[PDB]
Amino acid sequence: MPVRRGHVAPQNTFLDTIIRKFEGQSRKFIIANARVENCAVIYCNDGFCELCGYSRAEVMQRPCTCDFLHGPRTQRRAAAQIAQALLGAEERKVEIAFYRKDGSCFLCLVDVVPVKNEDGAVIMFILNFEVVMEK
Template sequence: MPVRRGHVAPQNTFLDTIIRKFEGQNRKFIIANARVENCAIIFCSDGFCHMCGYTRAEVMQKPCTCSFLYGPHTGRSAVAQMAKALLGSEERKLEISLYRKDGICFVCLVDVVPVKNEDGLVIMFILNFELADQQDSTANASPLKQHNNKFSIPWLSKGA
């Protein structure tokens, strides 16, 4: 006898389509839910993970301001621009200095794109990251100090 099913929630094919399109272009991007506090990250691409050195599990549910990538050279005006872009409903492009998990600084161009529902409300944000000089983020000069074959991040280390 066949099993009868009740209503099944449709899969979010819109989100799947966005992910497939961007991933196919080898982009570094995150998608954030604009309807929750801090606009939590609900997806991050492999390219984004490679660029910043964090795993997907470490990035998920963090605020999409990417404050976990901020460091000493991250400008206050860039941080304010990022916050302003996430408060508005218009697309913005900004330049910001970010830091990989291992402490390496890189300059990034960030496109903040709001995605609206049929009622015109922003439901999610897509943030696309491009390295400003189009070089691999691991090729930049490192601010790390080497102590006994271990690396420390100067602004995160308590004893440095």
């Protein structure tokens, strides 16, 4: 990429494990900035990492569309619906084939959940991932 933004301050680490134990952490999800046009990942879970076989260091400063995961089976119409879901103010699911780093494939359900701020405008997207059919 020709240019990138950082600005991530260090969080708590031990306490964050108590939130992860208390919360519904058992599914895959990532947080992306909705104001930036490409929708860069600003945060990610632990389940998304093991589901695809990448890492936070690789998926950080990337667009949340995950276009890199598209193989020969991947549906260009679904890749479009994920990109168009980032133009909407409301919740949206799209179904699509992704690859895993070991060379296996699967149908993923991608669900974007819009996060509004204190003024009632959408400023972050949470994208969740679920395996709907393993191939």
